[PDB]
Amino acid sequence: SKGEELFTGVVPILVELDGDVNGHKFSVRGEGEGDATNGKLTLKFICTTGKLPVPWPTLVTTLVLCFSRYPDHMKRHDFFKSAMPEGYVQERTISFKDDGTYKTRAEVKFEGDTLVNRIELKGIDFKEDGNILGHKLEYNFNSHNVYITADKQKNGIKAYFKIRHNVEDGSVQLADHYQQNTPIGDGPVLLPDNHYLSTQSVLSKDPNEKRDHMVLLEDVTAAGI
Protein backbone atom coordinates (compact mmCIF):
# COMPACT_ATOMS: atom_id res chain seq x y z
CA SER A 1 0.00 0.00 0.00
CA LYS A 2 0.86 3.70 -0.14
CA GLY A 3 1.10 3.30 3.66
CA GLU A 4 4.46 1.49 3.58
CA GLU A 5 5.86 4.27 1.38
CA LEU A 6 5.53 6.65 4.36
CA PHE A 7 8.17 5.01 6.56
CA THR A 8 11.06 4.87 4.08
CA GLY A 9 12.23 8.11 5.70
CA VAL A 10 13.07 9.16 9.21
CA VAL A 11 9.62 10.17 10.51
CA PRO A 12 9.13 12.48 13.54
CA ILE A 13 7.12 11.11 16.47
CA LEU A 14 4.82 12.66 19.05
CA VAL A 15 3.45 10.74 22.04
CA GLU A 16 0.85 11.99 24.52
CA LEU A 17 -0.35 9.93 27.49
CA ASP A 18 -2.96 10.95 30.06
CA GLY A 19 -3.04 8.42 32.88
CA ASP A 20 -4.80 7.63 36.18
CA VAL A 21 -3.27 4.87 38.34
CA ASN A 22 -5.07 4.26 41.64
CA GLY A 23 -6.25 7.87 41.52
CA HIS A 24 -2.78 9.27 40.78
CA LYS A 25 -3.24 11.40 37.66
CA PHE A 26 -0.29 12.13 35.38
CA SER A 27 0.65 13.18 31.86
CA VAL A 28 3.59 12.26 29.66
CA ARG A 29 4.74 13.84 26.40
CA GLY A 30 7.37 12.25 24.17
CA GLU A 31 9.11 13.59 21.07
CA GLY A 32 11.51 11.75 18.78
CA GLU A 33 12.16 10.12 15.41
CA GLY A 34 11.54 6.75 13.79
CA ASP A 35 13.69 5.14 11.11
CA ALA A 36 11.36 2.27 10.20
CA THR A 37 13.62 0.62 7.64
CA ASN A 38 16.03 -0.19 10.51
CA GLY A 39 13.29 -0.56 13.14
CA LYS A 40 14.93 2.14 15.29
CA LEU A 41 13.24 4.67 17.60
CA THR A 42 14.91 7.48 19.59
CA LEU A 43 12.46 9.34 21.84
CA LYS A 44 12.50 11.43 25.01
CA PHE A 45 9.53 11.43 27.38
CA ILE A 46 8.63 13.89 30.11
CA CYS A 47 6.14 13.76 32.96
CA THR A 48 4.54 17.14 32.51
CA THR A 49 2.42 16.77 35.67
CA GLY A 50 5.47 16.39 37.96
CA LYS A 51 7.00 13.21 39.42
CA LEU A 52 5.65 10.17 37.58
CA PRO A 53 3.80 7.92 40.10
CA VAL A 54 4.62 4.57 38.49
CA PRO A 55 8.13 3.47 37.31
CA TRP A 56 8.94 4.49 33.72
CA PRO A 57 9.41 0.87 32.45
CA THR A 58 5.71 0.11 32.98
CA LEU A 59 4.84 2.72 30.35
CA VAL A 60 7.41 1.70 27.71
CA THR A 61 5.07 -0.76 25.97
CA THR A 62 2.20 1.74 26.10
CA LEU A 63 4.59 4.50 24.88
CA VAL A 64 4.19 2.75 17.82
CA LEU A 65 4.87 -0.53 16.01
CA CYS A 66 4.49 0.93 12.54
CA PHE A 67 8.21 1.65 13.02
CA SER A 68 9.05 -2.08 13.12
CA ARG A 69 11.57 -3.30 10.53
CA TYR A 70 9.58 -5.80 8.45
CA PRO A 71 12.05 -7.80 6.27
CA ASP A 72 11.26 -7.78 2.54
CA HIS A 73 10.08 -11.40 2.64
CA MET A 74 7.51 -10.30 5.27
CA LYS A 75 6.38 -6.88 3.98
CA ARG A 76 3.02 -8.49 3.16
CA HIS A 77 2.35 -8.77 6.92
CA ASP A 78 2.97 -5.16 8.13
CA PHE A 79 -0.63 -4.36 9.13
CA PHE A 80 0.63 -1.35 11.05
CA LYS A 81 2.03 0.57 8.11
CA SER A 82 -0.77 -0.63 5.84
CA ALA A 83 -3.33 1.18 8.02
CA MET A 84 -1.48 4.49 7.54
CA PRO A 85 -2.03 7.32 7.18
CA GLU A 86 -5.66 6.68 8.12
CA GLY A 87 -4.21 5.31 11.38
CA TYR A 88 -5.13 2.48 13.79
CA VAL A 89 -6.38 2.02 17.35
CA GLN A 90 -4.30 0.10 19.88
CA GLU A 91 -6.17 -1.19 22.93
CA ARG A 92 -4.27 -3.26 25.48
CA THR A 93 -4.90 -4.93 28.84
CA ILE A 94 -1.76 -5.26 30.94
CA SER A 95 -2.02 -7.54 33.94
CA PHE A 96 0.89 -7.36 36.38
CA LYS A 97 1.27 -10.77 38.05
CA ASP A 98 0.28 -10.44 41.74
CA ASP A 99 -0.45 -6.70 41.28
CA GLY A 100 -2.85 -4.33 39.47
CA THR A 101 -3.86 -4.10 35.79
CA TYR A 102 -3.47 -1.39 33.12
CA LYS A 103 -6.13 -0.65 30.51
CA THR A 104 -4.84 1.48 27.58
CA ARG A 105 -6.60 2.82 24.48
CA ALA A 106 -4.50 4.67 21.88
CA GLU A 107 -4.84 6.31 18.47
CA VAL A 108 -1.83 6.02 16.17
CA LYS A 109 -2.25 8.25 13.12
CA PHE A 110 -0.32 10.75 11.03
CA GLU A 111 -1.07 14.35 11.94
CA GLY A 112 0.72 16.31 9.22
CA ASP A 113 4.27 15.04 8.71
CA THR A 114 4.38 13.64 12.25
CA LEU A 115 3.19 10.27 13.57
CA VAL A 116 1.25 10.69 16.82
CA ASN A 117 0.50 8.13 19.54
CA ARG A 118 -2.28 9.58 21.72
CA ILE A 119 -3.13 7.39 24.74
CA GLU A 120 -5.47 7.18 27.72
CA LEU A 121 -4.39 4.80 30.51
CA LYS A 122 -6.33 3.71 33.61
CA GLY A 123 -4.73 1.50 36.26
CA ILE A 124 -6.69 -0.32 38.97
CA ASP A 125 -5.91 -2.49 42.01
CA PHE A 126 -2.19 -1.71 42.22
CA LYS A 127 -0.66 -2.65 45.59
CA GLU A 128 0.53 0.40 47.53
CA ASP A 129 3.79 -1.29 48.53
CA GLY A 130 3.71 -3.42 45.35
CA ASN A 131 6.56 -3.41 42.84
CA ILE A 132 4.82 -0.78 40.70
CA LEU A 133 3.48 1.72 43.23
CA GLY A 134 6.47 1.11 45.53
CA HIS A 135 8.96 2.00 42.76
CA LYS A 136 10.81 -1.32 43.11
CA LEU A 137 11.50 -1.82 39.38
CA GLU A 138 14.98 -1.47 37.87
CA TYR A 139 15.41 1.32 35.29
CA ASN A 140 15.98 -1.00 32.34
CA PHE A 141 14.05 -3.06 29.79
CA ASN A 142 14.52 -6.61 28.47
CA SER A 143 14.07 -8.22 25.06
CA HIS A 144 10.68 -9.67 24.14
CA ASN A 145 8.74 -11.31 21.34
CA VAL A 146 5.41 -9.72 20.45
CA TYR A 147 3.29 -12.54 19.04
CA ILE A 148 0.91 -11.20 16.38
CA THR A 149 -2.09 -12.92 14.81
CA ALA A 150 -4.75 -11.67 12.38
CA ASP A 151 -8.32 -10.95 13.46
CA LYS A 152 -10.53 -11.43 10.41
CA GLN A 153 -13.60 -10.74 12.60
CA LYS A 154 -12.58 -7.15 13.47
CA ASN A 155 -10.45 -6.53 10.34
CA GLY A 156 -7.33 -6.05 12.47
CA ILE A 157 -4.85 -8.00 14.59
CA LYS A 158 -4.47 -9.30 18.12
CA ALA A 159 -1.20 -9.83 19.98
CA TYR A 160 0.01 -11.32 23.25
CA PHE A 161 3.37 -11.10 24.98
CA LYS A 162 4.79 -11.26 28.51
CA ILE A 163 7.06 -8.41 29.63
CA ARG A 164 9.74 -9.31 32.16
CA HIS A 165 10.38 -6.28 34.40
CA ASN A 166 13.55 -6.70 36.47
CA VAL A 167 12.98 -5.93 40.16
CA GLU A 168 15.54 -4.37 42.53
CA ASP A 169 15.53 -7.44 44.79
CA GLY A 170 16.54 -9.74 41.92
CA SER A 171 13.00 -11.00 41.32
CA VAL A 172 10.99 -10.43 38.15
CA GLN A 173 7.71 -8.58 37.78
CA LEU A 174 5.66 -10.17 35.01
CA ALA A 175 3.10 -8.34 32.89
CA ASP A 176 0.86 -10.22 30.45
CA HIS A 177 -0.03 -7.93 27.56
CA TYR A 178 -3.28 -8.54 25.69
CA GLN A 179 -3.43 -6.33 22.59
CA GLN A 180 -5.98 -5.51 19.87
CA ASN A 181 -5.38 -3.26 16.86
CA THR A 182 -8.22 -2.10 14.60
CA PRO A 183 -7.91 0.34 11.63
CA ILE A 184 -9.29 3.87 11.88
CA GLY A 185 -9.55 3.97 8.09
CA ASP A 186 -11.90 1.89 5.94
CA GLY A 187 -9.01 1.63 3.45
CA PRO A 188 -7.66 -1.89 2.61
CA VAL A 189 -5.38 -3.35 5.29
CA LEU A 190 -2.87 -6.22 5.19
CA LEU A 191 -4.33 -8.76 7.64
CA PRO A 192 -1.06 -10.71 8.27
CA ASP A 193 -0.14 -14.34 8.94
CA ASN A 194 1.17 -15.36 12.36
CA HIS A 195 4.59 -13.92 13.17
CA TYR A 196 6.35 -12.05 15.95
CA LEU A 197 8.37 -8.92 16.65
CA SER A 198 11.75 -9.23 18.35
CA THR A 199 11.90 -6.08 20.49
CA GLN A 200 14.89 -4.56 22.26
CA SER A 201 15.03 -1.30 24.21
CA VAL A 202 17.44 0.82 26.25
CA LEU A 203 16.42 3.29 28.96
CA SER A 204 18.58 6.30 29.74
CA LYS A 205 18.55 9.79 31.24
CA ASP A 206 19.35 13.17 29.76
CA PRO A 207 21.93 14.44 32.31
CA ASN A 208 20.81 18.06 31.90
CA GLU A 209 17.09 17.32 32.28
CA LYS A 210 15.56 18.37 35.61
CA ARG A 211 12.05 17.08 34.81
CA ASP A 212 11.11 13.46 35.50
CA HIS A 213 11.84 11.92 32.13
CA MET A 214 12.91 8.83 30.23
CA VAL A 215 15.09 8.57 27.12
CA LEU A 216 14.31 5.54 25.00
CA LEU A 217 16.05 3.71 22.19
CA GLU A 218 14.02 0.78 20.77
CA ASP A 219 14.97 -1.66 17.95
CA VAL A 220 12.04 -3.78 16.68
CA THR A 221 12.37 -6.35 13.87
CA ALA A 222 9.84 -8.84 12.48
CA ALA A 223 10.45 -12.58 12.18
CA GLY A 224 8.66 -15.95 12.22
CA ILE A 225 8.08 -16.42 8.46
Q: What is the resolution of this structure in A?
A: 3.2
Distance CA(50)–CA(27), nearest Å, equals 8
DSSP per-residue codes, 106-124: EEEEEETTEEEEEEEEEEE
Closest CA to 197 of 94, 79, 118: 79
How many other CB atoms sit within 10 Å of the CB of residue 178? 14
Q: What share of the chain is helix, strand, coil (3-state, %, to 5)?
A: 10, 50, 40
Distance CA(51)–CA(154), nearest Å, equals 38
Helical segments of 76-209, H only: 79-82
Run of H or E residues at 58: helix 57-60
In terms of C-beta distances under 8 Å and separation of at least 24 residues, what long-range contacts does 166-171 make, across chains too? Answer: 166/137, 166/138, 166/140, 166/142, 167/131, 167/136, 167/137, 167/138, 168/136, 168/137, 168/138, 169/136
Distance CA(68)–CA(41), nearest Å, equals 9
Instruction: Kindly report the CATH class assigned to 4-223.
Output: mainly beta
Domain extent listing, the chain: 4-223
Q: How was this structure determined?
A: X-ray
